[PDB]
PDB file of N, CA and C in Angstrom:
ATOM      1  N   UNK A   9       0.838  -1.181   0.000  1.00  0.00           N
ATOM      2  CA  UNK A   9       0.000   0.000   0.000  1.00  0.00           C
ATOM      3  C   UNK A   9       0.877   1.235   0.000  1.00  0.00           C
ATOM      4  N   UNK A  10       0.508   2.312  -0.776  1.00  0.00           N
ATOM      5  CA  UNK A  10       1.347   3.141  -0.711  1.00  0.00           C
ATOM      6  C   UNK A  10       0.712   4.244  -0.415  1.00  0.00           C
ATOM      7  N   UNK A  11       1.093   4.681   0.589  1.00  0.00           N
ATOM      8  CA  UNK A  11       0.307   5.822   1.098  1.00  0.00           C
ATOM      9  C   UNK A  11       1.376   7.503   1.034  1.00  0.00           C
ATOM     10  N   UNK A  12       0.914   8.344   0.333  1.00  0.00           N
ATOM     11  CA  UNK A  12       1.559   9.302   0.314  1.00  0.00           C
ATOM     12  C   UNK A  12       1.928  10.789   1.291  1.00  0.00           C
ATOM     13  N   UNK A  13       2.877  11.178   1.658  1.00  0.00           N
ATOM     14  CA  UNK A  13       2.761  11.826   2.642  1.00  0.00           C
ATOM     15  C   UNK A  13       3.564  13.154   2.569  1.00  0.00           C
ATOM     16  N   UNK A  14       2.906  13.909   3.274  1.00  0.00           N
ATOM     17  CA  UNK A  14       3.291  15.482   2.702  1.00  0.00           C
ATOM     18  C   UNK A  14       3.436  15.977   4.274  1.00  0.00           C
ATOM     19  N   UNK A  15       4.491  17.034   4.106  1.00  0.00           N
ATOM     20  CA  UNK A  15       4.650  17.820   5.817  1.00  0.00           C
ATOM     21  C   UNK A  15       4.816  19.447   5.428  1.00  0.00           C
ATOM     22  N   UNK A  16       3.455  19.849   5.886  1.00  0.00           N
ATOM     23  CA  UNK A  16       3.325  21.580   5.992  1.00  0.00           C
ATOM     24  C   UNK A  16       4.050  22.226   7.288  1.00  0.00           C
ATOM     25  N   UNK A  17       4.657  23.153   7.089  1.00  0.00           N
ATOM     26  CA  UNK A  17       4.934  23.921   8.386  1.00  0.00           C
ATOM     27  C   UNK A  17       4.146  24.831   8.840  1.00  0.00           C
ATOM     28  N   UNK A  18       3.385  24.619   9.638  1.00  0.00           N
ATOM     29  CA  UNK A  18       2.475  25.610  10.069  1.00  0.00           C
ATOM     30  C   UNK A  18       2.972  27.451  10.443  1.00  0.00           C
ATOM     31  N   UNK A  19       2.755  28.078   9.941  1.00  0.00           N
ATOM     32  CA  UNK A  19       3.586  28.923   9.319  1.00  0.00           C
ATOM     33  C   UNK A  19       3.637  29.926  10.579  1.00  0.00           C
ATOM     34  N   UNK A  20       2.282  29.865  11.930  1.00  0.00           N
ATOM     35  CA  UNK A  20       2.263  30.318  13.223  1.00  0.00           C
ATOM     36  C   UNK A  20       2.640  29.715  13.832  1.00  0.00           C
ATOM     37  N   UNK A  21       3.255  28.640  14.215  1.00  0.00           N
ATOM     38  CA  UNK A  21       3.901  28.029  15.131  1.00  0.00           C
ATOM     39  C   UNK A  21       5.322  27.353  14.229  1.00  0.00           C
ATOM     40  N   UNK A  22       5.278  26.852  13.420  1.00  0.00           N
ATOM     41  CA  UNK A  22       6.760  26.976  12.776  1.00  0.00           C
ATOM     42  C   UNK A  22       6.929  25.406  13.707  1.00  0.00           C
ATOM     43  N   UNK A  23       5.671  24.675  13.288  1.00  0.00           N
ATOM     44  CA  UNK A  23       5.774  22.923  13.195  1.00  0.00           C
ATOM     45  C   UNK A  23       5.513  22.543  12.016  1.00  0.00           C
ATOM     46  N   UNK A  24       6.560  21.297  11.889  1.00  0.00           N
ATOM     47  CA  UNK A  24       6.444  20.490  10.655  1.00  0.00           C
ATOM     48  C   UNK A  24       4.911  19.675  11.031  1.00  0.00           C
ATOM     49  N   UNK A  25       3.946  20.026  10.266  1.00  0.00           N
ATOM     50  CA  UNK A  25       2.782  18.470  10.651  1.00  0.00           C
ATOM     51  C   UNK A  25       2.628  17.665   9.307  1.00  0.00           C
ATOM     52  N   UNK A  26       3.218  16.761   9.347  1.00  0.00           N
ATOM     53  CA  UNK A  26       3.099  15.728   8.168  1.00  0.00           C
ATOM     54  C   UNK A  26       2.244  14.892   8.376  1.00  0.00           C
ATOM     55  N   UNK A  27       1.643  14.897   7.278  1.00  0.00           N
ATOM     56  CA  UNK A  27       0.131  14.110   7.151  1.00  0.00           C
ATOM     57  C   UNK A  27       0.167  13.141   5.735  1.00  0.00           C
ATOM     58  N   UNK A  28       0.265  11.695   6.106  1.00  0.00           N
ATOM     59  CA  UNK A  28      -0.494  11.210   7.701  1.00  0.00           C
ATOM     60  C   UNK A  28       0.913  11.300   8.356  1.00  0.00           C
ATOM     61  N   UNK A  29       0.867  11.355   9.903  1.00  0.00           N
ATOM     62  CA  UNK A  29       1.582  11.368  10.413  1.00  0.00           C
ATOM     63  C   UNK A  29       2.650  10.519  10.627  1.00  0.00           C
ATOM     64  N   UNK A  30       2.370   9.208  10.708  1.00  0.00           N
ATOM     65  CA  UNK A  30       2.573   8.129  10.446  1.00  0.00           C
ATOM     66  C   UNK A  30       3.746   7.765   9.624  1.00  0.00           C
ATOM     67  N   UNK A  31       3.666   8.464   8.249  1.00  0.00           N
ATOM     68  CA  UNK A  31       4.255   8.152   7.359  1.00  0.00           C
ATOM     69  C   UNK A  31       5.348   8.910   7.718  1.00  0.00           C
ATOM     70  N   UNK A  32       5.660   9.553   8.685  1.00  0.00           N
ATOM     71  CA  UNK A  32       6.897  10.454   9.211  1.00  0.00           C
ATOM     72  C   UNK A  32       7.324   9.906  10.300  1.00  0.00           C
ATOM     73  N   UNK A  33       6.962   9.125  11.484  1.00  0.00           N
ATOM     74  CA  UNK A  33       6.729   7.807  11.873  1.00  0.00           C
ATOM     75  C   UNK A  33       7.549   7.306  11.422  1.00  0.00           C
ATOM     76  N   UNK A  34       7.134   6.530  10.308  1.00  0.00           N
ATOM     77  CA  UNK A  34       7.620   5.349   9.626  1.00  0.00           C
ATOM     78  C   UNK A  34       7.088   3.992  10.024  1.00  0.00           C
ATOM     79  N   UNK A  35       7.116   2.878   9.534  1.00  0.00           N
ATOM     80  CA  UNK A  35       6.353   2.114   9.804  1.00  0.00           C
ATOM     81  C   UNK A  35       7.632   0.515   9.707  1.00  0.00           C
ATOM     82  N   UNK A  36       7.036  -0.281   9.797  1.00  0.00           N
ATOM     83  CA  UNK A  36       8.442  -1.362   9.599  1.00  0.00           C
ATOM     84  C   UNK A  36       8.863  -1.367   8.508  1.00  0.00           C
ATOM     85  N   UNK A  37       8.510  -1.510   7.291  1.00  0.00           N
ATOM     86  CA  UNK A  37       8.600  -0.769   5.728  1.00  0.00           C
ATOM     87  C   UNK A  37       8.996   0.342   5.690  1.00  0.00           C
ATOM     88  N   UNK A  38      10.719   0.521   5.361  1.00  0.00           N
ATOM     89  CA  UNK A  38      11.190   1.688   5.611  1.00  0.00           C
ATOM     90  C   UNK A  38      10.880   2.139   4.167  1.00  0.00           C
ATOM     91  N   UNK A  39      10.767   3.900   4.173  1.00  0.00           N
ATOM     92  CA  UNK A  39      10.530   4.700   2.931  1.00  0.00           C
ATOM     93  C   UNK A  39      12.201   4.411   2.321  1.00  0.00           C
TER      94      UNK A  39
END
């Protein structure tokens, strides 16, 4: 399954939130 994943920096607080989160995570299936 390939699930795609994107990370915005919230531009008022100046956090990475990558969505899904997960996929920044990582899972046992390394990217």
């Amino acid at each position: 399954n390939v699930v795609p994943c994107f990370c915005v920096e919230d531009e008022t607080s100046g956090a990475k939130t990558c969505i899904p989160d997960n996929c920044d995570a990582s899972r046992g299936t390394n990217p």
